[PDB]
Every structure is written in C-alpha cells, then in structure tokens.
Design a binder for this molecule. Structure first.
Ligand SMILES: [Mg+2]
Ligand SMILES: [Mg+2]
Ligand SMILES: [Mg+2]
Ligand SMILES: [Mg+2]
Ligand SMILES: [Mg+2]
Ligand SMILES: [Mg+2]
Ligand SMILES: [Mg+2]
Ligand SMILES: [Mg+2]
Ligand SMILES: [Mg+2]
Ligand SMILES: [Mg+2]
Ligand SMILES: [Mg+2]
Ligand SMILES: [Mg+2]
Ligand SMILES: [Mg+2]
Ligand SMILES: [Mg+2]
Ligand SMILES: [Mg+2]
Ligand SMILES: [Mg+2]
Ligand SMILES: [Mg+2]
Ligand SMILES: [Mg+2]
Ligand SMILES: [Mg+2]
Ligand SMILES: [Mg+2]
Ligand SMILES: [Mg+2]
Ligand SMILES: [Mg+2]
Ligand SMILES: [Mg+2]
Ligand SMILES: [Mg+2]
Ligand SMILES: [Mg+2]
Ligand SMILES: [Mg+2]
Ligand SMILES: [Mg+2]
Ligand SMILES: [Mg+2]
Ligand SMILES: [Mg+2]
Ligand SMILES: [Mg+2]
Ligand SMILES: [Mg+2]
Ligand SMILES: [Mg+2]
Ligand SMILES: [Mg+2]
Ligand SMILES: [Mg+2]
Ligand SMILES: [Mg+2]
Ligand SMILES: [Mg+2]
Ligand SMILES: [Mg+2]
Ligand SMILES: [Mg+2]
Ligand SMILES: [Mg+2]
Ligand SMILES: [Mg+2]
Ligand SMILES: [Mg+2]
Ligand SMILES: [Mg+2]
Ligand SMILES: [Mg+2]
Ligand SMILES: [Mg+2]
Ligand SMILES: [Mg+2]
Ligand SMILES: [Mg+2]
Ligand SMILES: [Mg+2]
Ligand SMILES: [Mg+2]
Ligand SMILES: [Mg+2]
Ligand SMILES: [Mg+2]
Ligand SMILES: [Mg+2]
Ligand SMILES: [Mg+2]
Ligand SMILES: [Mg+2]
Lengths: 49, 172, 106, 197, 127
RNA sequence: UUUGCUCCACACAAUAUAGAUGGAUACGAAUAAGGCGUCCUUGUGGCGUCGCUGAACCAUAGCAGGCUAGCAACGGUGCACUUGGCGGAAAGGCCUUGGGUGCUUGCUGGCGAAUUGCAAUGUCAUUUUGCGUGGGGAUAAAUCAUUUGUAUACGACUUAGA
RNA sequence: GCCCUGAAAAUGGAUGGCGCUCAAGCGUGUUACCUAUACUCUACCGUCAGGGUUGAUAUGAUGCCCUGACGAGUAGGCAGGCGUGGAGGUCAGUGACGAAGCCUAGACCGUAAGGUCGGGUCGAACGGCCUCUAGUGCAGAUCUUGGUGGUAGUAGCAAAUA
RNA sequence: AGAACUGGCGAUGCGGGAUGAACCGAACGUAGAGUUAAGGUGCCGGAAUACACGCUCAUCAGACACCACAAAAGGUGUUAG
RNA sequence: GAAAUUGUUGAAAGGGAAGGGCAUUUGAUCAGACA
C-alpha cells in the first residue's frame, strides 16, 4: 500500500549470506598494487590476537 | 499490381433504334492481362460518360508493343493519386526502355515513396520527352551528361557455400 | 586404396513435419554436395542405408542396417525426402546416412 | 564436410553467426568459434550498451540467484545468441550444444588449425557501408568482462609466432613454385594441361 | 493347411484402454465411453487416446481368422470335435479349459486322425 | 579383510557409441582496398601479376590391396630409435640431426584372385570396464570412539592424542 | 512518406523467443517452396439406396450377388449388441484323472461391451444354445459399511520443588 | 445494457492466428499416395539468409487483420510532390 | 484367500511432479506359418 513512514532497511545486503565462513583463516582477497621499483618484501603477516 | 502490358481498349454504348452507330471511345490501359484491362476501361469510362458495362460493349482490345524496345528513353509521367488525407496531381520523370517498363517502376515508386497502392493511382499521361533540356527532374538529368562513366564501389560477391576459406574482398 | 566409398555422405535431419506435428513415416535427408532440387533429382530412387552398431551379435555381426529409398525432392536447397523399411529412430536426427548409386541409370 | 569447423569470429555479425552455427550443430556439425571478442553487432556502441543494461535489470525478485544469468564475456554473449536458436531444453538440443565450443582469442589446438569464415554473416559483406556497428570486446568490457587486456596481450604474442610460421611457409612455396617451372614445358606437364591441370 | 486368404490386416492392434484407467486403481481398463461435458477425450482433442469406432472393423474376408487362417471353434469332447470333419482347412479346434487331462488325449488323438488342427495340444500334457 | 596398488606390454572377455569411412589444409590487416612476385633509395616506394570463390590444394591404382623379380633414381613416405631447439592461453604439441628398417604406382616384369553364385554395411572405427599372466615402480591415510572450546540445535567446525 | 519530439506507474520481461539495420524493418512487384481430419485417386468398415437370385442334387432367403452415394455431434430419440442372479427346454454338455473362484507387463478372437486358451493356486460343483424373468452392470452422490495409506517414527509424552 | 437480418459458439474436434469458446481456413469412419487452404519459409521450425525498385537509423526504431491502443500540435532529419 | 496398502528379491528409469498419444531404436519375451 506504501510504508506509512519511511525508514532505512535494517542491515547491509553487501554482507550476505550470513553463513559460517568456509574457514577460520579469513582469505586475503586482494594484495596491494605492485611497484617493482622497491625492494622485495612480504605484503602481509600472520599473527594471533 | 503486376508486370504490365499496355492495351488499347475500344468501347461504345450498345446500339439502339434511334441511335445505331454510337460514338466509340478508346483508352490506352496499363494492366497485366486483358481481364484487368477491360475492367479498368469501364472504370474510367464511368468517370467520363453516361455508360456502364451493362449498357455498353467492348469493341476491340489490342495489346500495344513498344516501338523501339531497345532504345533508351526519357519518360515524362503524369499521375493523379490519393493520399490518406487528400488527393493530388504529380509529375515524375522515368528513364527506361519501354512505356511498360516505365509504368512498372512508377507504381513501385508511388508505393515506396508515397505508400500509394494500385487502387489509388491514375496514370494521366505517359509520354516520351523528345529533346533533352525539357527533361526537368535532376535525378534523371544526372544520367545524360556527356561521356558519362562511373564505378560501382564495394563489390559484394554472393557465396554459394556457407563457409569460405579466404576472407572476401570487395574490390571491383 | 585408402578410400573405398561407393556411396554419397548424407544426414538425417527431420521427420516431415508442421510447426507442431511431425510424421515419422517420411524422413528428411541432406545429401552432401546437392544444392538444388534439380541436382537432387539424380538421387530419386537411390537407396539409403542407415548403418548402426549394437551390443548383441545377431546373424554373426554387431552391425545392423536400416534400409530405405529416396522418394522426392524437398524445398529449394537440394534436401530430399526418403522413406525407410522401418521409420528411423529419431535419436538419429543429425546422424550420418549413406546414399548408394543404385539403381543406376548411367 | 570436415569433422570440426573452426570459425574466426572477427568481423562477423553476432546473430547471423549465431543463426548459422545453431543450424550446423543441429545437423551434426561440430563447431568451434574463436576470437569472439572481435565479433560485431550492428548499431552503434551506445545502443547495444543500452540494450545490454535492459538485459541487466531482469532478475528474480525474490532471489536474484534463480533469475536470468548475465554472462559478461564476449563468448558467453555469443553463446546466448546461439542458445536462443536451439530447442535447448530437449535432449536433441543439449546434444547439439555439446558440438559447440566458443572462445576469446585463439587458444591451443586451434591456433595451428585453420579457421574459416561465414560470408553470409561477414559484417564487411552485409552492413551497408556507413552504418554504425559494435565490437563485442568493447561492449563486454563495459558491462563487466575482466580480460580484454590479457586477451589482447596473448593475441599479440600469438600473432608474432604466426607471422613467422607464415613467412617460412611463403618462403617454402617460392621454392616449390621454382619447381613447377623446370617441370613446366615438359611432356608430363603439357599432357596434364590437356586434361585441365 | 488353411484355406488360402488375403493378407490379414488388423487396423488397430493397440488395446482401447479406458481414460484414466491408468490413473486410479478404481478404474478398470475395460473400454468405457466418456460422457462428461468437458472431457478432452470425448471432445477428441489432439493428443488423447482414441476411442473404438466402426472404421476400425476388420475385412469381412479375414475377420475371425486367427494367424494360421483357421477360425477357432471351442471343443469339449470327441463328438464336438467331429463337427469339424469336413472343415479342416477353415476351422481349428480349441479344447475347452475345463476338459480333463485324460479326456484331452482322446480328443488330441482323434483330431490327428481326422486331420483337424488343434490350437492348444500342449494343455494338461502328461509330460 | 587371504596378495592388494600403480605406469608400460598382450591376451582373453564384456560394455558401450548424438553417429570415422582419403585430409580440421595455421599470418596479419584492409575492404572507397588487398595477396603474391620482383627491383630498389627499405617507403604511405617503382614495376609486374592475381581475384570474378574450395569447381581448390593435397592425397588417390595393387587380396580392404596378396606373393614375387628388375631398372632408373638418392627422391618420397611409414615405423621405431637417437641429436639439437621451440611452445604455459587449455603449453601436452611443433620443428631440427643422425644412422636403422619397411613401403614406393617414377618405369619395366612373373604369379594369385572365380563358387560371396545378379544386391543385402557385408563387419576393417573408438568408449569404459573386468579377469588372470610378467617387465618396471611405490609401500598411505581418512573415518568412528575419545578429547579442546577460537565452534556448535543436531550434523558441522576447530584442537589434542604411540 | 518513413523517422524524431510530443509519450508518466508500480515483482524482472516480452514483434511468441533469439536476434535482425542495402533487414530477418516499412510500401510494392515476381517466382519457387513448406503443410489440415479439406480436395483428387485407391483399399477396408459401417449406414442408406437401387438392382439381381427358390431350380434341384449340400450348409445361412432374417440369406447370397452386383452397383452408387454417404459417415462431426451435447440434450435427446430409436436400433443392433455385450455382461450378471434366477426359471422352462435342449446339448444323454464340463468335472475329484480337479467344478467354481482367485493370480499371471504369456497366447488368440472382437471397432467395443467382452470372449477364448495356457501356466500357477485351489477344492465341488459348473457351462453353450433357444427361450422366460428381474432386487441386472458404478468412479463420483461432504453416498453406506468395512478395510488401508501418505502425513510419521512426526506432534508430542514439559503444571503439582526431588 | 437493449433490438434487426444472416452467419457462428453453445453441441466441435482438425490447420492457422505463440497463447485463447466465437476470428481466418476447413467441419471429422480406419488408412495409403498426391495436391492445396488460411498461414508461413534467418535460427528456434517443415519451407528461397530468393529475386526486384524504393523508403527508413530511432541515447527508449520497427515488425501484419480481429488484437491486446495513442492524439492535438511540432521538426532547417530525410524523401518524393 | 481379491484389492487398497506393506517387506524382501530381481529388473529398469529418474537435472523442479508423474502418468498419456503417433512413431521407431534398444532390451526382454512370445504366437504362427514353413516343409
Ligand atoms: Mg513513501
Ligand atoms: Mg562447508
Ligand atoms: Mg509505342
Ligand atoms: Mg465415466
Ligand atoms: Mg470440468
Ligand atoms: Mg462445454
Ligand atoms: Mg549417445
Ligand atoms: Mg598490387
Ligand atoms: Mg612483398
Ligand atoms: Mg609497392
Ligand atoms: Mg588453395
Ligand atoms: Mg601395396
Ligand atoms: Mg580446449
Ligand atoms: Mg606389377
Ligand atoms: Mg599385475
Ligand atoms: Mg515494440
Ligand atoms: Mg519472427
Ligand atoms: Mg517486403
Ligand atoms: Mg484421412
Ligand atoms: Mg474418397
Ligand atoms: Mg455420428
Ligand atoms: Mg444377453
Ligand atoms: Mg443369467
Ligand atoms: Mg436376484
Ligand atoms: Mg498386473
Ligand atoms: Mg491360442
Ligand atoms: Mg491347472
Ligand atoms: Mg479350477
Ligand atoms: Mg470340501
Ligand atoms: Mg431370451
Ligand atoms: Mg439395483
Ligand atoms: Mg461410471
Ligand atoms: Mg467405488
Ligand atoms: Mg471417487
Ligand atoms: Mg458418473
Ligand atoms: Mg467411497
Ligand atoms: Mg477409516
Ligand atoms: Mg518408535
Ligand atoms: Mg519428538
Ligand atoms: Mg505441551
Ligand atoms: Mg461469422
Ligand atoms: Mg448448456
Ligand atoms: Mg467448430
Ligand atoms: Mg494449433
Ligand atoms: Mg497474436
Ligand atoms: Mg526458441
Ligand atoms: Mg528449415
Ligand atoms: Mg528458389
Ligand atoms: Mg487495419
Ligand atoms: Mg518531413
Ligand atoms: Mg486361510
Ligand atoms: Mg523391467
Ligand atoms: Mg510402442
């Protein structure tokens, strides 16, 4: 019929599905752009909270 | 409406006691066969005379053949036609090799440019324009300049099979 | 030599049909290199064999054949209609077929 | 005619390439199409872009996952035009489609296997000269396709190797022609002339 | 050994099963005519089962002929069997289902003697 | 768990087959322009030539292709080796060396073919698997139960345990 | 004339779809081609009609033979038939050496209602033909009575302190 | 909503109009061969990516009766008068 | 000692129902007719 009062949807559709991850180790979806001028190094690091 | 022939059709009102020998009127008619041609005849007579076919007779019907079928000719053509919202006179020039060929392209043209079907047209006159320079429409004049020549760029060969092994060339 | 072919390659295409109704009794055949009905007139009457394989041996063979004849031409592009001893199976639309050279008239 | 026919997509018109490919399949002719990124659609780029976003809005309202799928790749655009011309929910149709393979660029096997064209769908032979048209590769990249650059790069690499292959071959048939030459004007040669060879 | 006859043509070998007799157990396959007002079958829409009707009727020549060319005639005993003594090219004896084992060997024997064909000699056969 | 697994080899058995039956025969680019040849001053160059379809090119003769002899050539090609190199877009295939061996219808010979009876696909392809044989090769793990709590309704997850 | 503006609605979406641009678009012309239970010819069923044929010594005169045309169908009418319980007659019918019934993607006759046979099970009675007779044929009636499913190993078996 | 004449649907499948009671075509015994109707012949899909002359380029082109809509009014787009 | 419905065994098919029509392949099965 049409809401009545407008209000923003609850929660973000960009974080779906809200299932359990496929593993404890979250994946690195993306690394920094490469600049081959600089010395070789890692671009990330493992640790424990 | 088809591939035209041209007919002389001659008719008259039926004779009577007090009037034997009625007058005799002829029309040149462009139609694809003599049945359509005798019909067209009565159509037009009934727009000119007190007659109908029920009280008249066709006296003669005779196909007229082009006099010089392989001489190229510039035709003046006069037409009356009906549009969706009114009726109208027109002059077109056609260049072909026989009145018959000329009339076939006219009806084509009238159909394509003006959406006039065959029912809606009246050839008023078709006549060979004798001297050039009484040729009036440019799309024809174009073709009577001295020593005329022209290429046909972008040649398109028809394939005979679905696959080719070359890559065509439109040269010519 | 290397070739032994005594038939013309061909293809089972459709049954004779409407938009919405087919008729298994007549099969439609495309013949290699026949482009027109005039070309196809040559093959009218020639005999067709659909040759297939099977697991059970029969009269000492694992190869079987459905036999037929070309009967008339079809449309404008040298396709041909044919009838068979038994109507062709229809899993074979798009299967190969053999058009012999007999009965011969040359 | 041949067991597998490789079509060089470049310079062809999508729906006319599609219409003939579907047919060949249905009649049992295996087909592989290459360089689908160099495919054409008539009508200028903007129109076909607009047309594609029309496509993009269609989706299953309760679940966009079950709704129409929008493949961005120039080969998959192409497959769509094809699949649309094949009774593809029948077993016969599935069968037909397995006879088909469509690619961007010319990847192995096919880079050394000859490719043919289909004149009745050749853009340069069909479109009135002057009319605007659209390259599939460019249409795709603008709706999401990710790999124009890496096709372009691979192709350019591939094109180097094939100009060598070619150069060699053209050099080998200059000799071969310098053969058919001594042999010319000889008895066996004019005898073969006589019979049209 | 049967009168020569023209090739027997059967026109509709397939059984005319009742509509939906495949769909509910309660409906036997025995032919029964749709009388419903809306029924696709009775209205004969493209796609549904045929109904029996008189065009299917068999050549008056080959009708009642079973494959061998003989009409079959049910037989309960020698006397019945002897009604076919002048008709062995034309009728064939079938021994009735409730005829006893020993009584079939008598019938089977006489039929051999008279040259009368028997459609089911192997019945109750003491093998 | 009664001698299992794997790659190569051949043998038998079975099971298939969306449909072998001479050959999928490799520039690129343009189309109001190009391909090829040739020269040169190497260029948006001169000169020649070609198209108008693959109606081509290549292959193709021999018991479905038998058994044999010779000559002219030194060429062609099958096979298995071996030399050097290339190809990662799905390379898994291409090119090159060298000896061996077969075939050669380039040409000339000797023998064979019938009775499959006037046609009957007249059977010559390539899928997957199963059982033994012997020539190489290789000698794990997962799950239940127990256990953690970075996890959990139950499954699941995540730990730990010679 | 075609095209453009004028031209705003609710799930994503329809020249039937793909797609199409010297069209696979619009107007018009010319051929060819595809295909209805319709038209033409033929066979076979049945309906109606018009003929022919009692002459013994063989078998249907409601018969047999020749010929022509016709065939949609609710409500409804009539006709010829199929099937059940019981009755008169008949076949000196079937049967404990297995009646009846029941089972059987086995066989055969009939356009069909149905009829016949084989095999298995079974255990005491039963059937063809001419007639007589009716409490004579079921898918439905929120039909009657009995039996049985899916639902489902599901809801649940949690008040009264242990 | 209501009348007139006819033809239909209801009571009727079959081919066409994708689809659909009534539109087009054509009315039905079981079948073989042939030829057609209305309607089609790029591909789905049987059937010319046939021939021929024009016209049309749309940043919401257009695409076949019943039929699934568009008007006044405008354009120095282009066409022929 | 039917049927609904059920267990086992054997055979077969199964990408959002199943069943049906005309037709043929394949498999399984079976009648007849021959001399
Ligand atoms: Mg609001
Ligand atoms: Mg998971
Ligand atoms: Mg004149
Ligand atoms: Mg009923
Ligand atoms: Mg109803
Ligand atoms: Mg009704
Ligand atoms: Mg298969
Ligand atoms: Mg040149
Ligand atoms: Mg050069
Ligand atoms: Mg130059
Ligand atoms: Mg060549
Ligand atoms: Mg040899
Ligand atoms: Mg691949
Ligand atoms: Mg020799
Ligand atoms: Mg071993
Ligand atoms: Mg529209
Ligand atoms: Mg269309
Ligand atoms: Mg047109
Ligand atoms: Mg008929
Ligand atoms: Mg008739
Ligand atoms: Mg009737
Ligand atoms: Mg009765
Ligand atoms: Mg009774
Ligand atoms: Mg009673
Ligand atoms: Mg049963
Ligand atoms: Mg029997
Ligand atoms: Mg028994
Ligand atoms: Mg019994
Ligand atoms: Mg007792
Ligand atoms: Mg009675
Ligand atoms: Mg009662
Ligand atoms: Mg009932
Ligand atoms: Mg009941
Ligand atoms: Mg009920
Ligand atoms: Mg009822
Ligand atoms: Mg009940
Ligand atoms: Mg109950
Ligand atoms: Mg329990
Ligand atoms: Mg519970
Ligand atoms: Mg409770
Ligand atoms: Mg009417
Ligand atoms: Mg009513
Ligand atoms: Mg009707
Ligand atoms: Mg229909
Ligand atoms: Mg419509
Ligand atoms: Mg479709
Ligand atoms: Mg077609
Ligand atoms: Mg033609
Ligand atoms: Mg109108
Ligand atoms: Mg204007
Ligand atoms: Mg008991
Ligand atoms: Mg089974
Ligand atoms: Mg069947």
């Amino acid at each position: 019929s049409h809401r009545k009062y407008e209000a923003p949807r609850h929660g973000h559709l960009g974080f779906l599905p809200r299932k359990r991850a496929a593993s404890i180790r979250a994946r690195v979806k993306a690394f920094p752009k490469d600049d081959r001028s600089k010395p070789v190094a890692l671009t990330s690091f493992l640790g424990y909270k | 409406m088809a591939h035209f022939k041209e007919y002389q059709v001659i008719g008259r009102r039926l004779p009577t006691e007090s009037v034997p020998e009625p007058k005799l009127f002829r029309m040149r008619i462009f139609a694809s066969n003599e049945v359509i041609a005798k019909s067209r005849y009565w159509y037009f007579l009934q727009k000119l005379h007190k007659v109908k076919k029920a009280s008249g007779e066709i006296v003669s019907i005779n196909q007229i053949n082009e006099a010089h079928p392989t001489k190229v000719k510039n035709f003046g053509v006069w037409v009356r036609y009906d549009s969706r919202s009114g009726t109208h006179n027109m002059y077109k020039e056609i260049r072909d090799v026989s009145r018959v060929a000329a009339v076939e392209t006219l009806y084509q043209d009238m159909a394509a440019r003006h959406r006039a079907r065959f029912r809606s047209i009246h050839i008023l006159k078709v006549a060979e324009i004798e001297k050039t320079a009484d040729v009036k429409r440019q799309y024809v004049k174009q073709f009577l300049t001295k020593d005329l020549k022209f290429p046909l760029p972008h040649r398109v060969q028809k394939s005979t099979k679905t696959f080719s092994y070359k890559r065509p060339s439109t040269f010519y | 030599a290397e070739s032994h072919r005594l038939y013309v390659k061909g293809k089972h295409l459709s049954y004779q049909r409407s938009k919405r109704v087919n008729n298994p009794n007549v099969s439609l055949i495309k013949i290699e290199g026949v482009a027109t009905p005039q070309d196809a007139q040559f093959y009218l009457g020639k005999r067709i064999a659909y040759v297939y394989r099977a697991s059970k041996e029969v009269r000492g063979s694992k190869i079987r054949v459905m036999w037929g004849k070309v009967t008339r031409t079809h449309g404008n592009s040298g396709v041909v209609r044919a009838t068979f001893r038994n109507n062709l199976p229809a899993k074979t639309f798009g299967a190969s077929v053999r058009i012999f050279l007999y009965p011969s008239n040359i | 005619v041949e067991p597998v026919v490789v079509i060089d997509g470049k310079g062809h018109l999508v729906g006319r390439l599609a219409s003939v490919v579907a047919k060949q399949l249905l009649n049992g002719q295996k087909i592989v199409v290459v360089r689908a990124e160099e495919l054409n659609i008539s009508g200028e780029f903007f129109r076909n872009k607009l047309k594609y976003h029309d496509f993009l809005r269609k989706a299953t309202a309760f679940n966009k996952t079950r709704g129409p799928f929008h493949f961005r790749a120039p080969s998959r655009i192409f497959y769509k035009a094809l699949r649309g011309m094949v009774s593809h929910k029948t077993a016969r149709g599935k069968a037909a489609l397995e006879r088909l393979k469509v690619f961007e660029g010319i990847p192995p096997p096919y880079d050394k296997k000859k490719r043919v064209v289909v004149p009745q769908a050749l853009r340069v032979l069909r479109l009135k000269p002057g009319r605007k048209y659209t390259t599939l590769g460019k249409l795709s990249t603008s709706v999401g396709w990710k790999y124009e650059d890496v096709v372009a790069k691979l192709e350019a690499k591939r094109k180097v190797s094939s100009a060598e292959y070619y150069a060699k071959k053209r050099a080998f048939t200059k000799k071969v022609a310098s053969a058919n030459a001594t042999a010319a004007e000889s008895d066996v040669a004019k005898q073969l002339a006589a019979l049209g060879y | 050994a049967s009168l020569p006859h023209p090739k027997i043509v059967k026109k509709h070998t397939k059984k005319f099963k009742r509509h939906h007799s495949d769909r509910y157990h309660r409906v036997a396959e025995n032919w029964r005519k749709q009388k419903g007002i809306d029924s696709v079958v009775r209205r004969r829409f493209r796609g549904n089962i045929s109904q029996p009707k008189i065009g299917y009727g068999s050549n008056k020549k080959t009708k009642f002929l079973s494959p061998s060319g003989h009409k079959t005639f049910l037989v309960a005993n020698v006397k019945d069997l002897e009604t076919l003594t002048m008709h062995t090219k034309t009728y064939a004896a079938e021994i009735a289902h409730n005829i006893s084992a020993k009584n079939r060997v008598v019938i089977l024997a006489r039929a051999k003697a008279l040259g009368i064909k028997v459609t089911n000699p192997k019945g109750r056969l003491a093998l």
